[PDB]
């Protein structure tokens, strides 16, 4: 079920250590066509918005939100793509969410299942993992259900979730 590898935990793992572990995993799973000759410098052979696909930040942004299964509960264009080297301020990458999901399926989904990098934190308010809308506190980095924050004056959830949306600070951090 799990890769042995002994790769560093995802909070402190370097990009090079991560990518070398992805290459080794893809080879042991028999997906030889995904690992070109020329080693790490040539991996992956995929381009997004005219730059080589940035698998490290794609992976970090998805597993920090609960993994690929969260699906369209992740804002791929607005919160995943924006953290990748492939992002540019002005771009016409209108199908980028679909593209990123396809690349994640190709390079990273089996890898995700074979590692222990997915965030499964509970709500800082109610202490459960109930399904629903969540926001990450910009101050402490913990996660809260939007519905568990009953303070007046909060925006609509969609205004937190849209690209470069509202700042969220949880009730425990707020001064």
């Amino acid at each position: 079920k799990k890769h042995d590898c002994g790769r560093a935990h995802i909070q402190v793992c370097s990009e090079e250590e991560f990518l070398r572990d992805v290459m080794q995993f893809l080879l042991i799973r028999g997906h030889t066509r995904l690992v070109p000759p020329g080693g790490l410098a040539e991996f992956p052979d995929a381009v997004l918005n005219s730059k080589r696909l940035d698998l490290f930040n794609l992976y970090r942004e998805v597993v920090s939100r609960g993994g690929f299964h969260v699906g369209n509960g992740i804002n791929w264009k607005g919160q995943v793509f924006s953290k990748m080297r492939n992002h540019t301020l002005t771009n016409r990458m209108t199908g980028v969410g679909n593209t990123l999901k396809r690349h994640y399926e190709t390079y990273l989904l089996e890898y995700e299942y074979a590692h222990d990098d997915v965030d499964g934190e509970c709500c800082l308010i109610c202490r459960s993992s109930t399904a629903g809308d969540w926001v990450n506190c910009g101050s402490c980095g913990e996660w809260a259900h939007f519905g568990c924050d009953r303070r007046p004056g909060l925006g609509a959830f969609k205004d937190y979730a849209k690209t470069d949306g509202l700042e969220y600070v949880c009730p425990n951090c707020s001064v």
């Binding site: 939100r65 509960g73 969540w134 979730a161």
Partner: peptide
């Protein structure tokens, strides 16, 4: 903010 919908 960083968000997710589960």
């Amino acid at each position: 903010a960083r968000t997710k919908q589960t």
